Amino acid sequence: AVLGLQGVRGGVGTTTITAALAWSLQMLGENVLVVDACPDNLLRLSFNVDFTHRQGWARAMLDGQDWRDAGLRYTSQLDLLPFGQLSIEEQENPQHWQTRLSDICSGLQQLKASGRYQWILIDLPRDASQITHQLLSLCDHSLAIVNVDANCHIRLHQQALPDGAHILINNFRIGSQVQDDIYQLWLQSQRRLLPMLIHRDEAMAECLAAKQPVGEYRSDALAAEEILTLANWCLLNYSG
Amino acid sequence: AVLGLQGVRGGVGTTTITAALAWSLQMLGENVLVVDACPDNLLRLSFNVDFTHRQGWARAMLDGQDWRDAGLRYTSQLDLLPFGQLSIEEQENPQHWQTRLSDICSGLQQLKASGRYQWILIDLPRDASQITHQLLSLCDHSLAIVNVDANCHIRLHQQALPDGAHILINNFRIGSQVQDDIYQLWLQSQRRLLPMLIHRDEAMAECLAAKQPVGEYRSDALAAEEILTLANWCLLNYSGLK
Amino acid sequence: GYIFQNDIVALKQAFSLPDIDYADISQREQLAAALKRWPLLAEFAQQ
Amino acid sequence: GYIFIVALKQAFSLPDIDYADQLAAALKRWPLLAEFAQ
Ligand SMILES: Nc1ncnc2c1ncn2[C@@H]1O[C@H](COP(=O)(O)OP(=O)(O)OP(=O)(O)O)[C@@H](O)[C@H]1O
Ligand SMILES: Nc1ncnc2c1ncn2[C@@H]1O[C@H](COP(=O)(O)OP(=O)(O)OP(=O)(O)O)[C@@H](O)[C@H]1O
Ligand SMILES: [Mg+2]
Ligand SMILES: [Mg+2]
């Protein structure tokens, strides 16, 4: 199955959750490819890829090279495809390249058809670019990552989500009446809300600084157990 | 002066800080215009604008109308220019309109020259669109909003910031070991960090749900006092023109 | 309310607003108080 | 870095960071931080 993960807004935890979910699925015995579709190219740093390593599928594609040679094997069950490092000029002119990347769609479609991987997880950025839409269209299912706050609340009444997406809460914390109020309202009103959530957890803040997925970094972290609940739900509901 | 505020990443507090800083500046006697340059059109909700009110400078402009009729008065010293509500089709086709908004620049440059406002604050989205770059070029100064975490740490080593931007920490709370490590490292190494920060404060989480800027919602909140310290710093250091 | 067309692989991607149901909010008193505390939440639920 | 109709330009550069010279414990704790500091 191809699973897209996309924040309803930036900064909600999409990339850390993608890396953690890939690790969880592997621990459950699955073969996983994790693809970074974000021009920020941050997913690779959860898998101990050197910051100075500039290769990636989009970097290769823009350079006229074979994107399939930019993949990395993290474990026997977990493969990674970084986006690649853009120059500042590329970063500040996405219109120059965001329509030159269509080849990735046919390449991932071929990978899908081969059955090489049991799961392909795609970390999708919070934009509406041509390449983001193209990658979404390849997904069998998608998760929309939120935090329980007034900003995400508003966004859920005005921005479209991929059809069939389910909503996953991250960063749930103690000490917030307004969060608790929004959450109780969501429980009665938000038809697409998943029944499990992820708390704000120091392991999820530390694991990127340690350059590992959360469940490798701290296998008994409460957040690692919450991600496993998500993984088990995905196996049951998102498999095909 | 025109002051741009832009997050280093999405979700770091940029819009709440823009609304709060505008409130603080107008509390200090300044006439302020706050402009929402973000297509998500969230800033207006900090000023009790009805969600179903769709008008805005970009809405009007895309509809062949005068952006100057989309302004709103919050107080006698605080005006608001919402972006306007885009359809789902417009949201998912940003290339259609991101290149058709450049006339806002001469309109704001003319509004600047008139001296009607001592401050024009622009809430800038976390993107690199043509219109974002255009509005950024009108700013005399800019703030880059961060939270203290590993993601923002990485971004400060790989993405460009507008030249001359200062970095403003938001959502700070002591007690996280990794966050305290990053923060102490930034103190010794980030040469453009501002001397004040904004703590995590439930007033900042509540004020949007109350549809008010933080200083109006809870004037004695720590975050409101910190935004006032920021406003005083801006009067001192950012009042010059570019 | 939008369908993206991906001709390069012959796929479509539909988008729509999230599925939200406010029909049964009045029944829980815990939600009635939260709606009174926060005008933003009341605004969406009244509609 | 990068430099962006009307007579206005906007320069872009990476943030000014100085790793010239307590924090040694922070760098040993987190390989990500040690990575940028070397
Ligand atoms: N549950 C959590 N508890 C604590 N920290 C968290 C949690 N989830 C994420 N973080 C931290 O928050 C920061 C942002 O996380 P992440 O990079 O996953 O977000 P994102 O939505 O992918 O951001 P971006 O908009 O940059 O793509 C990181 O420093 C991460 O370590
Ligand atoms: N200092 C703070 N303390 C507590 N909560 C905060 C603080 N700053 C912001 N928040 C909360 O974080 C959420 C996001 O804030 P805001 O909308 O200002 O961020 P943003 O960076 O403008 O987001 P976006 O990328 O959608 O434009 C809001 O619900 C806000 O109430
Ligand atoms: Mg991310
Ligand atoms: Mg904002």
PDB file of N, CA and C and ligand atoms in Angstrom, chain A residues 11 13-16 36 38 40 42-43 123-125, chain B residues 151 155, ligand 3:
ATOM      1  N   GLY A  11       4.835  22.020  10.469  1.00  0.00           N
ATOM      2  CA  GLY A  11       5.333  21.944  11.831  1.00  0.00           C
ATOM      3  C   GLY A  11       4.572  21.039  12.781  1.00  0.00           C
ATOM      4  N   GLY A  13       4.466  17.793  12.973  1.00  0.00           N
ATOM      5  CA  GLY A  13       5.108  16.516  13.259  1.00  0.00           C
ATOM      6  C   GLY A  13       5.059  15.488  12.132  1.00  0.00           C
ATOM      7  N   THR A  14       4.700  15.884  10.905  1.00  0.00           N
ATOM      8  CA  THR A  14       4.518  14.924   9.810  1.00  0.00           C
ATOM      9  C   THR A  14       5.770  14.081   9.556  1.00  0.00           C
ATOM     10  N   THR A  15       6.938  14.712   9.503  1.00  0.00           N
ATOM     11  CA  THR A  15       8.154  13.990   9.122  1.00  0.00           C
ATOM     12  C   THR A  15       8.604  13.027  10.217  1.00  0.00           C
ATOM     13  N   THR A  16       8.596  13.478  11.473  1.00  0.00           N
ATOM     14  CA  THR A  16       8.953  12.588  12.574  1.00  0.00           C
ATOM     15  C   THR A  16       8.011  11.403  12.638  1.00  0.00           C
ATOM     16  N   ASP A  36      10.860  10.934   0.671  1.00  0.00           N
ATOM     17  CA  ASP A  36      10.729  12.330   1.092  1.00  0.00           C
ATOM     18  C   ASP A  36      10.312  13.165  -0.107  1.00  0.00           C
ATOM     19  N   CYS A  38       9.316  16.313   0.354  1.00  0.00           N
ATOM     20  CA  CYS A  38       9.418  17.694   0.838  1.00  0.00           C
ATOM     21  C   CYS A  38      10.712  18.335   0.363  1.00  0.00           C
ATOM     22  N   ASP A  40      12.334  20.558   1.680  1.00  0.00           N
ATOM     23  CA  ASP A  40      13.184  20.790   2.840  1.00  0.00           C
ATOM     24  C   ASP A  40      14.135  19.623   3.106  1.00  0.00           C
ATOM     25  N   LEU A  42      14.213  16.924   5.004  1.00  0.00           N
ATOM     26  CA  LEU A  42      14.502  16.676   6.412  1.00  0.00           C
ATOM     27  C   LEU A  42      14.357  15.216   6.824  1.00  0.00           C
ATOM     28  N   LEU A  43      13.591  14.419   6.077  1.00  0.00           N
ATOM     29  CA  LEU A  43      13.319  13.048   6.510  1.00  0.00           C
ATOM     30  C   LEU A  43      14.600  12.238   6.672  1.00  0.00           C
ATOM     31  N   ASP A 123       6.270  11.266   2.674  1.00  0.00           N
ATOM     32  CA  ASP A 123       6.231  12.493   3.467  1.00  0.00           C
ATOM     33  C   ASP A 123       5.944  13.640   2.511  1.00  0.00           C
ATOM     34  N   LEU A 124       4.734  14.177   2.580  1.00  0.00           N
ATOM     35  CA  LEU A 124       4.318  15.191   1.623  1.00  0.00           C
ATOM     36  C   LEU A 124       4.333  16.579   2.254  1.00  0.00           C
ATOM     37  N   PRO A 125       4.817  17.595   1.542  1.00  0.00           N
ATOM     38  CA  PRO A 125       4.857  18.943   2.112  1.00  0.00           C
ATOM     39  C   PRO A 125       3.488  19.601   2.086  1.00  0.00           C
TER      40      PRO A 125
ATOM     41  N   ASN B 151      14.200  20.700  14.321  1.00  0.00           N
ATOM     42  CA  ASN B 151      13.782  21.061  12.970  1.00  0.00           C
ATOM     43  C   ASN B 151      14.202  22.495  12.642  1.00  0.00           C
ATOM     44  N   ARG B 155      16.931  23.943   9.830  1.00  0.00           N
ATOM     45  CA  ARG B 155      16.549  24.941   8.831  1.00  0.00           C
ATOM     46  C   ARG B 155      17.488  26.141   8.851  1.00  0.00           C
TER      47      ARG B 155
HETATM   48 MG    MG E   3       8.303  17.753   7.568  1.00  0.00          MG
END
